[PDB]
């Protein structure tokens, strides 16, 4: 209202439009990095699922157990990426349990688990954090996968939530099961196949387990790294729209000041 | 001043973490005891108008929740417990309330004799 | 108005000094995170094991007494 | 009226088997039914110094033990039962006892209403 109270409010969104202008090209180019890192990735991504597309797979009627993973991010700041893969996990565990099937969800994300923390918290299987600030590598798709064996829970079915975007603009929440069985993928179209026996398959099945978690790295951190690009820029438009609108109302104030206390020495004069 | 000096402590600590509004780590053992006590303590000096209460029954509203008696009722509810638990101390408990009085001070032997009454009152009073 | 020395200018500290909602969210930011740090460095501050041995002493002479004690009621006994 | 013609009545045929009371367990079942109820009513009639009571007040006291929900209790704990049921009616119950404080007459509108309340405090009390 006052004069010392228009300078304080002015100056303190200098300060948020300087920063959202510096934390747009800071996370702009993190985002040609992770565009030009994708292609090499891109078809030993495509590669590793290939083989379940020229065979006819589904996980027939019914099984007893049941792994969700979810991926995102350790960062916020990036719109609605991590709203959008809550919704989804929330949406196929009320489904799958009018079957009765019993479900273990595992986050390798800070903030999945942070939002889960309410209403399933005891059916965490284990939570992966600090992921997000370096760039995501195979090692640590070997990291996760090994855990996912070696907890002591033997699963059946299985299904992973990620988002792969499209363009700058627009990402797209998808997914994509996993078949992780040894005897589910024991069907129909593996007896044309060749000598593999349930040793072999048992370690070749594993091996596709890491390259569905680093194909899903590889799409979620360019999907969080453009979205925030986009979160930053509207924070920076809605801070000079606002920056312009103050500094009208600090020249009108400025005027009224000097204006005002002429009238005084003027009114103290001429009744003296 | 042996009742309010650990009131006021508490909510010092309670305005310096609940300026939020958007939590995301959840600190439920570490700071939910302390901003979770300061919500119950605020609603403890809420008070409604010509009605100015005496200094004996004053410590007798502080101290039922200073050391903790009402963490486990809901937020909503400590408005209706009080002028319940106003009504069970000055019609059964007089000579309690005269000890505070003319005493000036609270003693050892009325300290645990304070303890009991909150205790019968709170067993009772939830349906 | 910032392109010249004329207009205003803001310095650095100019967020806490207006006391608004990223004024207070900064507030509890800072001692929200940095108050786990006074859980884990006083957690492993307890770790110290000459404090240890102290106390497995005091409580052994804390024991000790209480036998001494029963050694007397025998003794009253017989 | 209506609640001492049933209880003048049953303390009466207690004073006749009274003598049995003493080196009794080889009786009849009916011998021992009023050595049990004629024992809970004696219970009831105790009542401390300078403590007058309500009519309207004796009449929910009285009520529960002539009616039938005293019997599975311990002699000893009548006299505590009786002093957690009045409390408990006065607070939370107030609106009922000045329906017979006004009526006069217990009508079957409050004859099935304290059903409601003396079995539904005979539950939660036994701790």
């Known amino acids: ?272 | 001043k042996q009742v309010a000096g650990t009131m006021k402590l508490e909510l010092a600590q309670y305005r310096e973490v609940a300026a939020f509004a958007q939590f995301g780590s959840d600190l439920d053992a570490a700071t939910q005891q302390l901003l979770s006590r300061g919500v119950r303590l605020t609603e403890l000096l809420k008070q409604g108008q010509y009605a100015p209460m005496a200094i004996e029954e004053q410590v007798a509203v502080i101290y039922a929740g200073v050391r903790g008696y009402l963490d486990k009722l809901e937020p909503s509810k400590i408005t209706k417990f009080e002028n319940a638990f106003l009504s069970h101390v000055i019609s059964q408990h007089q000579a309690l309330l005269g000890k505070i009085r003319a005493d000036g001070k609270i003693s050892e032997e009325t300290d645990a004799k304070l303890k009991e009454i909150v205790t019968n009152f709170l067993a009772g009073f939830e349906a | 108005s910032s392109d010249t020395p004329e207009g205003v200018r803001s310095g650095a500290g100019a967020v806490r000094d207006a006391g608004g909602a990223f004024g207070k969210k900064e507030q509890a930011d800072e001692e929200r995170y940095f108050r786990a740090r006074a859980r884990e460095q006083l957690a492993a501050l307890k770790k110290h094991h000459e404090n240890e041995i102290s106390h497995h002493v005091k409580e052994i002479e804390r024991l000790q007494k209480e036998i001494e004690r029963h050694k007397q009621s025998i003794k009253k006994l017989k």
């Open chain 1, 1 to 272: 209202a006052t004069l010392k109270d228009i300078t304080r409010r002015l100056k303190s969104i200098k300060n948020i439009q300087k920063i959202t202008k510096s934390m747009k090209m800071v996370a702009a180019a993190k985002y040609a990095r992770a565009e030009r890192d994708l292609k090499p990735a891109r078809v030993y991504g495509i590669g590793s699922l290939a083989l379940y597309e020229k065979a006819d797979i589904k996980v027939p009627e019914d099984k007893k157990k049941h792994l969700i993973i979810g991926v995102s991010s350790d960062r916020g700041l990036c719109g609605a990426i991590h709203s959008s893969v809550a919704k989804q996990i929330k949406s196929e565990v009320a489904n799958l349990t009018a079957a009765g099937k019993e479900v273990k969800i595992v986050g390798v994300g800070d903030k999945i688990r942070g939002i889960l923390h309410r209403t399933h918290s005891d059916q965490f299987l284990v939570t992966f954090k600090e992921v997000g600030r370096k760039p995501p590598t195979f090692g640590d798709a070997s990291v996760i996968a090994l855990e996912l064996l070696n907890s002591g829970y033997e699963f059946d079915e299985g299904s992973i939530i990620f988002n792969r975007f499209r363009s700058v603009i627009s990402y797209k929440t998808e997914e994509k099961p996993i078949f992780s069985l040894d005897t589910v993928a024991s069907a129909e179209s593996m007896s044309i196949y060749d000598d593999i026996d349930a040793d072999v398959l048992r370690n070749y099945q594993e091996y596709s387990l890491a390259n569905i978690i680093y194909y899903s790295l590889k799409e979620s951190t360019t999907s969080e790294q453009s979205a925030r690009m986009t979160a930053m820029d509207n924070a920076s438009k809605n801070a000079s729209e606002m920056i312009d609108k103050l500094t009208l109302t600090f020249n009108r104030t400025r005027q009224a000041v000097i204006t005002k206390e002429l009238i005084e020495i003027i009114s103290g004069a001429a009744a003296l």
